[PDB]
Design an enzyme around this catalytic site. Structure first.
Site, PDB file in Angstrom:
ATOM      1  N   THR A  54     -28.074   7.221 -48.118  1.00  0.00           N
ATOM      2  CA  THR A  54     -26.847   6.937 -47.329  1.00  0.00           C
ATOM      3  C   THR A  54     -26.293   8.263 -46.814  1.00  0.00           C
ATOM      4  O   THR A  54     -26.336   9.226 -47.575  1.00  0.00           O
ATOM      5  CB  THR A  54     -25.808   6.144 -48.135  1.00  0.00           C
ATOM      6  OG1 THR A  54     -24.537   6.225 -47.488  1.00  0.00           O
ATOM      7  CG2 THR A  54     -25.642   6.622 -49.557  1.00  0.00           C
ATOM      8  N   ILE A  63     -16.978  -2.526 -44.518  1.00  0.00           N
ATOM      9  CA  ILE A  63     -17.085  -3.001 -43.113  1.00  0.00           C
ATOM     10  C   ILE A  63     -18.075  -2.081 -42.406  1.00  0.00           C
ATOM     11  O   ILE A  63     -17.844  -0.860 -42.424  1.00  0.00           O
ATOM     12  CB  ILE A  63     -15.711  -3.014 -42.417  1.00  0.00           C
ATOM     13  CG1 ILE A  63     -14.674  -3.824 -43.199  1.00  0.00           C
ATOM     14  CG2 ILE A  63     -15.861  -3.515 -40.990  1.00  0.00           C
ATOM     15  CD1 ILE A  63     -13.279  -3.733 -42.637  1.00  0.00           C
ATOM     16  N   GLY A  77     -24.805  -1.338 -40.605  1.00  0.00           N
ATOM     17  CA  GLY A  77     -25.670  -0.428 -39.824  1.00  0.00           C
ATOM     18  C   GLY A  77     -27.142  -0.594 -40.174  1.00  0.00           C
ATOM     19  O   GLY A  77     -27.493  -1.693 -40.655  1.00  0.00           O
ATOM     20  N   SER A 120     -25.657   2.142 -48.402  1.00  0.00           N
ATOM     21  CA  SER A 120     -24.371   2.368 -49.105  1.00  0.00           C
ATOM     22  C   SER A 120     -24.020   1.155 -49.981  1.00  0.00           C
ATOM     23  O   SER A 120     -23.519   1.367 -51.096  1.00  0.00           O
ATOM     24  CB  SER A 120     -23.266   2.728 -48.154  1.00  0.00           C
ATOM     25  OG  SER A 120     -23.166   1.766 -47.121  1.00  0.00           O
ATOM     26  N   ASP A 128     -16.219   1.645 -42.460  1.00  0.00           N
ATOM     27  CA  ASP A 128     -17.327   2.487 -41.930  1.00  0.00           C
ATOM     28  C   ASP A 128     -18.040   1.685 -40.839  1.00  0.00           C
ATOM     29  O   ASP A 128     -19.291   1.612 -40.861  1.00  0.00           O
ATOM     30  CB  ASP A 128     -18.313   2.918 -43.020  1.00  0.00           C
ATOM     31  CG  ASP A 128     -19.336   3.945 -42.542  1.00  0.00           C
ATOM     32  OD1 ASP A 128     -19.056   4.631 -41.526  1.00  0.00           O
ATOM     33  OD2 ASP A 128     -20.401   4.086 -43.203  1.00  0.00           O
ATOM     34  N   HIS A 131     -15.992   2.207 -35.612  1.00  0.00           N
ATOM     35  CA  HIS A 131     -15.112   3.405 -35.527  1.00  0.00           C
ATOM     36  C   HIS A 131     -14.277   3.349 -34.243  1.00  0.00           C
ATOM     37  O   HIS A 131     -13.684   4.387 -33.885  1.00  0.00           O
ATOM     38  CB  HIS A 131     -15.926   4.703 -35.621  1.00  0.00           C
ATOM     39  CG  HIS A 131     -16.894   4.739 -36.751  1.00  0.00           C
ATOM     40  ND1 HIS A 131     -16.522   4.429 -38.049  1.00  0.00           N
ATOM     41  CD2 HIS A 131     -18.177   5.167 -36.805  1.00  0.00           C
ATOM     42  CE1 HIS A 131     -17.554   4.629 -38.844  1.00  0.00           C
ATOM     43  NE2 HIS A 131     -18.582   5.088 -38.108  1.00  0.00           N
TER      44      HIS A 131
END
Ligand SMILES: [Mg+2]
Ligand SMILES: [Mg+2]
Ligand SMILES: [Mg+2]
Ligand SMILES: [Mg+2]
Lengths: 379, 378, 379, 378
Positions: free
Chosen positions: B165, B195, B198, B203, B261, B264
């Protein structure tokens, strides 16, 4: 090189001292002398290198105008190397103030979460922009491994024992969690540790890693000088000869911790305790591994039960009774033996015993306390 | 979502009374609980050390019932497990069910000793002495499996590098800031929402390993159900749609911890906070990673400084003033906003902000405290 | 007496050093010089005396042949006294080796559970045998209070704030738990702490108690020399005059911790930070209490919202944006200010802010990272 | 014994899921839970500081229901509480029910901030400025009550002196040895049995205060029901009668921790261990205080050294040899006794011994390990 082990000791003590004391040391020795001692520590604690292709990571240390640059090379299965070269184009960079890095390697107390160092991560890529999937993944892992070797974050002693391949954990013995319970409170302390019984040196490497402020001393009757390195000294001495044990303490003590993992010859176990327990720091800990030889005739043991007088388990039973010396009936005047007076706690597990040294004089039960359940219900 | 609730019950029982843990083991039985405990050991013992195919036995006993599993460890391979007899396997680990439940899912200091039985090469293939390889590989194998059987504090920095990560080791240096602000929840039966998944999930696996008693929820607009595993659920939803955020909390919450995350995108960051902060546990933490998009026009940011109204850094500045709301001049008629009333601590570092939720109502400085030398002279 | 505050500092540093360093200090100073510094510490930390009738408790310290005896007198509502007298008939006794008691008062790391001291509890009673219910109860409480003053067992900062009667906890403010979160990791460290803003001295007493290895420095524009005592020095200086702040650091720094609980005049708050933040140790913490004056015209504040430029809350908003300096767009060349470069964390609670000092240079987001959610789904 | 089970449920819920704590608060209601929380605050805030009669208000709210209590603190007097209106009381503390349940009975690091509301003298009797006394007494009053509302680690040495138990401060120096060996259980919902109440109960109150989530059981042959209070039950039984010991464990156990501070009669000490060690939780601790009676004929001891068979020190010596049972020479036919098999750690200090229970089965030194130079030469 007993002038070189005193220089590391001085850097370690200043790391947990006043700003003035750390300023006076860095002034006297200078960057050029201290930096290589810090680089040696980083190589030792950043190993093992991750499973990656040859990647360079730069480390720069600055102190009052002066700055020194090193480049470390990490590669899957290879020893991490360092050379004093310019950072040049190397895109993975770590920067330290000398005082920060001394406290980060050798300082006591909570590791710093943030602000101990500067970093540059692939601001330029060999790719030109977005780096190769390899370059990026290898980059993360390389700079992470070096940063991990730059601090004193608490290690898992169970993993260290598997990593350095010592028989202290993972089959023959399950000791390392009990070592964490009894030695954990000293990790932050500038300790001098003696392991009797060192082919070998695995457990010495583990103690050097665990006690980030420690000086490790390996005692064996055979030469082991090929294991010697920073904070790790081997000494030739026989644990059956009190004069050789004394010489070891006279030269390299006093010790906060002494571990007997030697011949396991009952006589040797008894001689090392009788000689070294008095020389161990009060509040310090004496450990005896491999109690089983108590019952092995080939180790001066007896194959009977209860264990025969002069065997390690019989000794542990007498020490246990020794802790209650003040409550024992003594015909006329009596002074407690060194072991009755200075052993405040005995921890007995499977195949291992921990002896806490301390002042054992709380006074016995006063004479005015009733000595029958008679006089209690009669009051 | 009936499989998530069974693990949650085993996790809660692990931190409850002996009676409550006895009730649960009786209801579910060894046969249902065992595979859940084996799934954890495989997840936490990973990765296998650099060794040749070595078998390790794990036996689990409860009230006269016993079930045996044999695990296969090999350099660079996924650890396997099969419910098999253990008779011919010379590396063995023995656990009572209540002990192995506490060791995996219990709060409290890792037990130093007496949690398990172990048989280490009492018999060898040779039958007189084991080879250098056999012994060395044995130590490593049974060591790896034993490390997977417990909840000994992991180094969150190493977990991030192992799970690959970006939370540590180059782009970001977050993980020690997470240890600082989330560490006190490691032992708690948390529900954590991250949130942005990806590709991805690294993570989520990190959080699963860190919170040994936690249920991890990964929220993304794209399907990520291929990551779903024990204590790890992916939810499809949009952090720009308040009704989809509410549906995530209505189904899988409430959350002790929420990390942004995601995209953005400044607007999304603001919408997610406005909707989810009121649903976050009181005493819980809300985190926003990657504050830099504050300054990126491509993210709904403005390339100016001070940061423009409606950008993440401007929001953090207003939150900071919000914590002092009782000391601000206003009409008694003033009523504090949800964030003024419920944000008790704001922690700002490089590219990350941690928001403590709690009751922010200690009262403003009493009116009888002097405000000048005008009042000191009387 | 800046030769007397250096002697305490030396005893404190040796308490967390090598056996050799502690041996060299106890040799140089001797028992006769060190003992009274240890007795002063015991009186300060054993207070308050329990609700009991005048009871005597004896404390003896021994070092290499020499031994010194003190008798402490405890009484309900009275200051604990000590005199260098023989233990004589006093039936409540505590004995220490000098090195143990130095580590017990000034040592870092886990308090020792057992074996740090000797004790004699009512081996003789004025009663003749079983003691009076008063003598026994008062005896327990007396010797317990002195032993509590002989160590460094973690204190509850909330209770210390109530005990010394500082406004840091229990009504006007609820700070002490946040001080434990941000300063707790330094309790074991030989820290130099500066509190700007000292009638008064309550909070200074609390810091002396909390940091058992600390030197406490109280800065006020008025004389407070009547508060001066061991490890607690008051200094006259104006927090609105940079040259007076510098003189304070030049004489008594550098500080690990600086707390601004002064005039709360916005200008003074800004001047103290601009001058002292650069002089604070990196990894150290700067604290500003009483943010509310931000909004009070009588403190150079403005009664508007958002807070007016040049007020404490406006400053905290700029520091917060300063932490992101590397991610900010900068037309042409730019160097970060001292505060952008050295502030790695800002903690904002109700009426208080904690500023972590450290190296804030991880590098901004690389240019190769996409600056639109366009180029992400286009890759 | 229905009142003990209600507290146990509030304690367990405090360390469980939000859902589990929501279920419990819904079932019992605020009206039933509140007085249990008020009882704890009175017990933990004790003693009142040296001040004049001062009133402190504690308000507890849940799902629209609110209940107010006013506490009266005065130098040298028992703290009182009445369910009263708080309108005229200028010292106030406000708590949500779920927050006050976690603050009292939750495991985990004390919350630094945002757990409660507080109103401190926003209005004074004078109505312009409070007196020096009014302000000083206010600080102390609301400070004492707030300290009682949480689970901040207490110093077990100070608790022993405050509760006036002989476990610290003269006859014995035990309490730091208890912190060492029981400390890891402070956060756990323990059931602790102390054999011997001895008038008495001081140590029971000490354990109640230390284990904020614990149920404390005091066992004595004489009636001590006058000590009974929330989380503290006295049981009448004889530690010399195995059937009366079993009845104590069958009704109030199992116990995480068992302390023998009873008659100190060697035979009783041996009978209590033989009966209760097998019933003690695995991973639990068994403690024997006052080993000195080993040497006292009036206690069934012998005034000789080494200590005579059937005396406490002889028993501890045999336990120590028992831990090595796998390494002792015997016939394969040998089967280990309960104590050989289940005693994994023995901690001996001055006048006290701590026995760790767990599985003692790591296997004895394999037969392929050399036992001489006889084997080394081959
Ligand atoms: Mg060995
Ligand atoms: Mg990111
Ligand atoms: Mg103030
Ligand atoms: Mg007793």
């Amino acid at each position: 090189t007993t002038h070189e082990i005193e220089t590391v000791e001085r850097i370690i003590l200043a790391a947990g001292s006043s700003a003035a004391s750390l300023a006076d040391l860095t002034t006297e020795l200078g960057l050029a002398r201290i930096a290589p001692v810090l680089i040696d520590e980083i190589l030792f604690r950043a190993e093992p290198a991750p499973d990656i292709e040859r990647t360079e990571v730069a480390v720069q240390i600055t102190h009052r105008g002066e700055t020194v640059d090193f480049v470390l090379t990490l590669q899957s299965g290879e020893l991490i190397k360092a050379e004093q070269r310019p950072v040049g184009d190397v895109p993975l960079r770590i920067g330290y103030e000398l005082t920060d890095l001394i406290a980060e390697l050798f300082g006591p107390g909570a590791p710093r979460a943030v602000g101990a160092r500067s970093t540059n991560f692939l601001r330029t890529t060999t790719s030109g922009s977005i780096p190769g999937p390899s370059e990026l993944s290898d980059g993360f892992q390389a700079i992470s491994a070096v940063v991990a070797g730059c601090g004193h974050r608490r290690p898992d002693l169970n993993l260290l024992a598997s990593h350095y391949r010592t028989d202290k954990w993972g089959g023959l013995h399950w000791f390392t969690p009990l070592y964490e319970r009894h030695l954990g409170e000293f990790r932050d302390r500038p300790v001098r540790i003696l392991e009797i019984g060192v082919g070998g040196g695995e457990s010495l490497k583990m103690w050097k890693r665990y006690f980030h402020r420690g000086l490790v001393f390996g005692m064996d009757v055979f030469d082991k000088s090929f294991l010697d390195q920073q904070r790790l000294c081997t000494v030739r001495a026989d644990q059956s000869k009190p004069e050789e044990l004394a010489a070891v303490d006279d030269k390299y003590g006093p010790f906060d911790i002494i571990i007997d993992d030697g011949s396991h010859i009952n006589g040797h176990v008894r001689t090392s305790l009788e000689t070294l327990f008095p020389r161990l720091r009060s509040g310090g800990v004496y450990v005896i591994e491999d109690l089983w030889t108590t019952y092995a005739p080939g180790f001066g043991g007896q194959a009977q039960c209860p264990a025969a007088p002069g065997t390690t388990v019989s000794l542990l039973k007498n020490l246990l009774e020794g802790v209650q010396h003040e409550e024992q009936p003594h015909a006329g005047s009596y002074e407690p033996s060194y072991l009755e007076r200075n052993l405040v706690g005995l921890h007995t597990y499977h195949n291992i015993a921990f002896l806490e040294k301390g002042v054992n004089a709380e006074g016995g039960v006063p004479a005015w306390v009733p000595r029958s359940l008679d006089d209690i219900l009669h009051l």
